[PDB]
């Protein structure tokens, strides 16, 4: 059916692979210790075009730890497109322009089946609350990556199109030159019975490194949480600057929050960077802003997240809004190493700022919330009348004071 | 005892130096950023100018380009505190001009007693003015210019007075309000020496022509150099401004609510009429006794007080606009001590109440927009109006015993 399916089973212990049952028409697995599932669906469509599109969804509230076979997706539902002629207005979200792409962002899950080209329907178990999705649309191919966790016994059989399965375990590594070892199996085209599995070894140097284990390298703090402009403080005093390592904070903010890009050197802000206009004056321009902010090593770095004024409505109340910036250190590596692995590939996103030969070390992703109150839109008449009456009385009193005879 | 003028100047210089050293040491060591945001804006504009680029690329920079040109030695010479030194020098020049003005006036107009030291120390020995000058605020420079042209009017140097008046008008648009009184004085200033209307009218035309030509030449030169953005950000902003951030002004909440609405109310476009009416009414009092410099100074002080009080925006930095004129008003004042104490107490109490409401709103997110902020603004405006009326009564009483000592 012009479908190709690739399944990846990331385990934690070598003995866990023993528990895997290989029946003549499938593979039955019972979870042992928080294994990871990576599903890759590939389609071929004509779709004559010369642009790339990315649709990445990661649950903001998700607490799942990233694996070596998964990229660090930007939190929330994001759509990037590098085309400079088509218009991006899906779901009523105004795009944000950047020298490489137009981007749409949201913090709540949206339906994806209406965006997938060709009107293709397939047996996808959309589980937005417990899975991470990444859809890549190319000139002639469509790829769908789903990262999930197994919490129950599952049986994999011959799905639509060609099917290939691979179970891997992470051997000894030094957070570089990562080696996976395990089994690879394929499904016959003429029958629903599995083939003969073979030993396989994959060697690759990742460009997405996770150091989120322990040792509180760069603690994150938030001060003035109740205030309108809470301060985000990052501690890098104990870490010395390296030759090619530069730390950064990447934040996708809504239209009600902006960052003064002149606070720190080497900060880039795309979208609504206006420092004066309120929320109701720039709400319809775009969905917000994307900011990448550099940090100075050896000293505490402070970032201010200002908030605008919201349009008054009936029954005055506050409109708390949250966002999650991510802290990552980017290091340049010589242009000889092959920074390519079969699992994930570079594409549009926050990686488009940096070059091709970069490696990211993700440290912390502490989330922030801002409370913004608005008044009641029923006191306009009272305010008008009181203000004008007071002003008129004051000028009348001053005029009376002026007319006083001399001597 | 009686302080010596030389000793007063020396102690003022010592205070300025000590505060500057405090500032530089605290900036270097403490992570509190004593320097104000305005100095950061000016420094960024100076950097843009030094890199052969328009200073208006820096957001929220609406000053004239001359400020950035003056601060250029920040980047021409590798230091950051040069603007602070220039502002401190301007503040010292302002104090010296105040002392010289009082000394010259005491020998031409009959005065009550000897009070040069106290009235000079009102400005030269104020930690508030010291903090304003040493934090990078540029107001002092404007203040200096003002005194300069006024001094040129005292010593019958009308041409340089007109040139400096035009320069100050170019720097900030508000000194235009001084045009109506000063002109009258100039005419009378020549009627008491030469009994020929021709010479006085010619001198008035000369000073008007000089100030107009200086203003127009500076405007044309700046526009030609820096494009339409200069004209926009310098002139049209005051026309399309929608300042809604909390401030001492009475029109704050009204302007916020009006900016919320898409169509302005009919009785909401006359926010400029009361200010013009009261300014003209206060200006007309100069006719009581022309050819008098103390009366002119009092009229200018009342005009500045009324303009700041009725302005659509008013913060803690707008007070200095009239504080410079405080000594000349208070040299021959007749207010009882209890009345002055009452005025000061009411002023400070209203300011403290508004500051508490604003701090609650900013650092706690509470909804104190309609009931809290508006009432505090109304109370502050009423107190300011009462103080202005009292000062007008004071100047009307003063105008009596300010006879000349002509032979
Ligand atoms: C009699 C006579 C002929 C009548 C004519 C008279 C004419 C028409 C009235 C004038 C009415 C217009 C000119 C608005 C004044 C503009 C602002 C008043 C200037 C200054 O613009 P701003 O105040 O917005 O700018 C602020 O200034 C303060 C200064 O402390 C800073 O702290 C802030 O950071 C900010 O820069
Ligand atoms: C921004 C730059 C251009 C400097 C701004 C300051 C000057 C324009 C001011 C500061 C000191 C002023 C001077 C201070 C004292 C005098 C002496 C004064 O002479 C008299 O009193 C003449 C009558 C007499 O004494 O016989 C005439 C004005 C003048 C030159 C002033 C002219 C204007 C000056 C040069
Ligand atoms: C990421 O930031 C969190 C902030 O909560 C760090 O967790 C805290 O670290 C401090 C040390 O600075 C401990 O005292 C706390 O007990 C930790 N937990 C909490 C809930 O505050 C975490 O260590 C940081 N991670 C990295 C890799 O820097
Ligand atoms: C708006 O602000 C109010 C005032 O704080 C919030 O009310 C409390 O919020 C805390 C947040 O942890 C809750 O635990 C309390 O139960 C809330 N008290 C109430 C609702 O009476 C409120 O959460 C804010 N956000 C809204 C109303 O959406
Ligand atoms: C759950 O997963 C985490 C990492 O994802 C792992 O460290 C832990 O051991 C797992 N739980 C168990 C019971 O093994």
Numbering used by the authors:
A (entry chain B), B (entry chain A): 2 to 408
From the manuscript:
GPI-MT-I is a heterodimer composed of the catalytic subunit Gpi14 and the auxiliary subunit Pbn1, which together transfer the first mannose from dolichol-phosphomannose (Dol-P-Man) to GlcN-(acyl)PI, forming an α-1,4-glycosidic linkage. This enzyme complex is widely conserved among eukaryotes and plays a critical role in fungal growth, cell wall integrity, and hyphal morphogenesis. Gpi14 has 12 transmembrane helices, with both the N-terminus and the C-terminus located in the cytoplasm. Pbn1 is an endoplasmic reticulum (ER)-resident type I membrane glycoprotein with a single C-terminal transmembrane helix.
The overall structure of Gpi14-Pbn1 complex measures approximately 60  Å  ×  55  Å  ×  125  Å and reveals a 1:1 heterodimer of Gpi14 and Pbn1. Within Pbn1, we identified three N-glycosylation sites (N35, N319, and N365), consistent with observed band upshift in SDS-PAGE analysis. For donor substrate entry, the upper portions of TM6, TM8, and TM9, together with EL4 segment, form an open door-like architecture that guides Dol20-P-Man into the funnel-shaped channel. The dolichyl tail forms hydrophobic interactions with Ile174 of EL3, Ile177 and Ile178 of TM6, Met277 and Leu281 of TM8, and Phe308 of TM9. Meanwhile, the mannosyl group is coordinated through an extensive hydrogen-bonding network.
